[PDB]
Amino acid sequence: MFENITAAPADPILGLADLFRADERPGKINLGIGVYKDETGKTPVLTSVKKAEQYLLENETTKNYLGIDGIPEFGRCTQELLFGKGSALINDKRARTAQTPGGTGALRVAADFLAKNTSVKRVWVSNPSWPNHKSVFNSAGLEVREYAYYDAENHTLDFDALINSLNEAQAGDVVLFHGCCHAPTGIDPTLEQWQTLAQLSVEKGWLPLFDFAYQGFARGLEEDAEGLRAFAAMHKELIVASSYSKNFGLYNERVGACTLVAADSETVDRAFSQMKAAILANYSNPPAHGASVVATILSNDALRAIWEQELTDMRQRIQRMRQLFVNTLQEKGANRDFSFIIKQNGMFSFSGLTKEQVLRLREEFGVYAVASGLVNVAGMTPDNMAPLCEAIVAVL
Amino acid sequence: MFENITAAPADPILGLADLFRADERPGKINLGIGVYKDETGKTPVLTSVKKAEQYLLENETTKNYLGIDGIPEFGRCTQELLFGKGSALINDKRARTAQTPGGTGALRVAADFLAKNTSVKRVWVSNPSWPNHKSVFNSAGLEVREYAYYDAENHTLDFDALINSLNEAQAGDVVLFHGCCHAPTGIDPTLEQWQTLAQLSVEKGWLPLFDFAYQGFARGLEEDAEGLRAFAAMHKELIVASSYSKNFGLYNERVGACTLVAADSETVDRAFSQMKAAILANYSNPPAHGASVVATILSNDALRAIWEQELTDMRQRIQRMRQLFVNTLQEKGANRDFSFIIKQNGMFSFSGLTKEQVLRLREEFGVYAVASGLVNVAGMTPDNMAPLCEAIVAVL
Ligand SMILES: *Cc1c(COP(=O)(O)O)cnc(C)c1O
Ligand SMILES: *Cc1c(COP(=O)(O)O)cnc(C)c1O
Prior knowledge:
Chains A, B: Its EC number is 2.6.1.1. The structure is a homodimer of 396-residue chains. Chain A is α/β, with parallel strands linked by helices. Chain A folds into 2 domains: 11-44 and 316-396, Aspartate Aminotransferase, domain 1, CATH 3.90.1150.10; 45-315, Type I PLP-dependent aspartate aminotransferase-like (Major domain) (Aspartate Aminotransferase, domain 2), CATH 3.40.640.10. Helix content of chain A is 44%, strand content 14%. Chain A is built from 14 helices and 13 strands. In chain A, helix 8 links the parallel strand 7 (174-178) and strand 8. In chain A, 51% of the residues are buried. At the A-B interface, helix 2, helix 5, helix 6, helix 10 and helix 11 of A face helix 2, helix 5, helix 6, helix 10 and helix 11 of B. The structure holds pyridoxal-5'-phosphate (PLP) (2 copies). The site of one pyridoxal-5'-phosphate (PLP) has 12 residues of chain A, from helix 5.
């Protein structure tokens, strides 16, 4: 009974992918990638995780099932990462972490637990946000409304429009925040704006849900967590879905976590058991290899030092490319003020190009970008920067 | 808003697990395990998969995302395994395989695709069946009804009761079949009964869904697939959810597949895209490591030969333990006819013990079994067999 099944829509970036690797003209640059690439245009496996994998290969004696919530060093290590090494949330044990199939997995499992065990009906997502947000919440039956965020004109956070649309949210609604490196704009709240949002969130009764996929990409591990940390000193309950796909280069091993924080130990345990019921009814218990690698890097001082250096080198490469982009455009010369690029954090930002301009970029030059003008800065190299900027100057 | 959350029910086997590893009296035998154990009571990682993992460690250059459906050798290898190396289904390409987070993952993703894209409302599951079946289908909004299967008295397949309850199923209902080694009874249809079921299934318009977790444990790889194969020569459409957790000893790496078969190439592609939409909204794209290991063993003749020997040794160990169990009980002596144990396939079977007897087994002897009298034959060793049988004889 499958003949009247309508084909699923062409996926936003995976379409571009197929179109690109069909254009036989190799001056082509794909900036619509979604993954990190180094100066060589390669997405390598990190040295710390290969050292990790050799260790595991030498020491694993069984592939027997992990518990519903995954390996128990993993969840003490990401909540130390998230909340700080001596957080009251950890000492009073009101946080529980379930290891999930990446950050998307963490969001579907939070959405199913919420849909089955609480009275939430709406989730507020930023306009724009990472596109797969709507699908995950909708599939668990939650409805997505969106709140204002990006100011197209100044290319900044329209904070007043943000605070103003978020008042049609009632008490008991969930509001999704990107912890650092907002996808897709790269504009983040400043710590002071985070603190007002945290204060407004208690007054209004929002359930905060942090999507935290880029820890370490804006400024550093601790610094990037201070927004979330302003929101867990103020609130009895919150959920954070984190990913290790990007900061560990472990994309395909699916490594993420769903952390539940509640008022005290008794209620977080009673709620976490229902979150465990949600995992049993989906994939039963999580993938060992990627989370195992993360646990031994983060618990070993020597391996952790290496990973931290490797993550800082990624972060700096992105910051150098954003810088090189802005002034190589100023050398190729056009009426521009692309300096907002320097102000945004992470791999993505809107270039400000129109869809007709990204179309003739693709068609006439072989530069591939997402139709919204979204560009991934990690697809730029010292070598492809000059043809890239010539192409952009020529279409402006 | 978590304080009135009711704790999730005590999990059927994981409870026994905690109770067992709290009984400080080491003549204790846990037969309620659910996993394979060798003669040493260990669940080892196979030699073929460690050889596999060394190869992958030496040759992987990226952990970049797999496509929604996973690695493309994996899905040609399990549908060759499932349908036979030159099946018409494969040559006419009407089957598509998505690599999923184990066999449970394959069932949730089949359930979500069905619930969102077709008009199914009921799934028929055997009484008894693997317990997590109800939860997976219920969470996607499908309702579970059950069909008769096990005859408690003769300890056999009550085939007529089976065919008779399955007539309240209407056209468009899904009926779940265990491909071989029925969990939890170990009684399988004979090929002739499979063929009548296949013929009755077309006449009535059932969507067959095969749960195939034990390939290679009843008789051998090809032999164990002939039931499913009687049901894919007769039917335009079916879904099979397979697992690699047990036959590859890869439990915690989550390795499974959801294969969709439709009337022809065009419709299976159009349906498969919606199945891909279901993955995007859940965990996005699957775990590479376990499926990667399975792909290189199954594609390498030398590694595949080793795995096949290793799987036959598991199968034979279980068959020898079922045999040793029945006659060591006949040596310890009681009014019994435990010979039905020899007739059942796989790791599980109902011992026929009452819940009061399994209770005094636990309490007075330290032998742990599931309250229904369910016993896992792979928890028996040549060494623990004699105290085990004494304990059972003493409670009969
Ligand atoms: C990458 C990302 C995720 C999910 O990552 P996984 O690959 O599923 O671990 C979630 N939210 C945002 C904003 C992301 O960028
Ligand atoms: C083991 C099993 C599954 C699922 O196995 P995974 O560990 O999730 O791969 C599904 N059905 C039956 C009958 C099983 O025994």
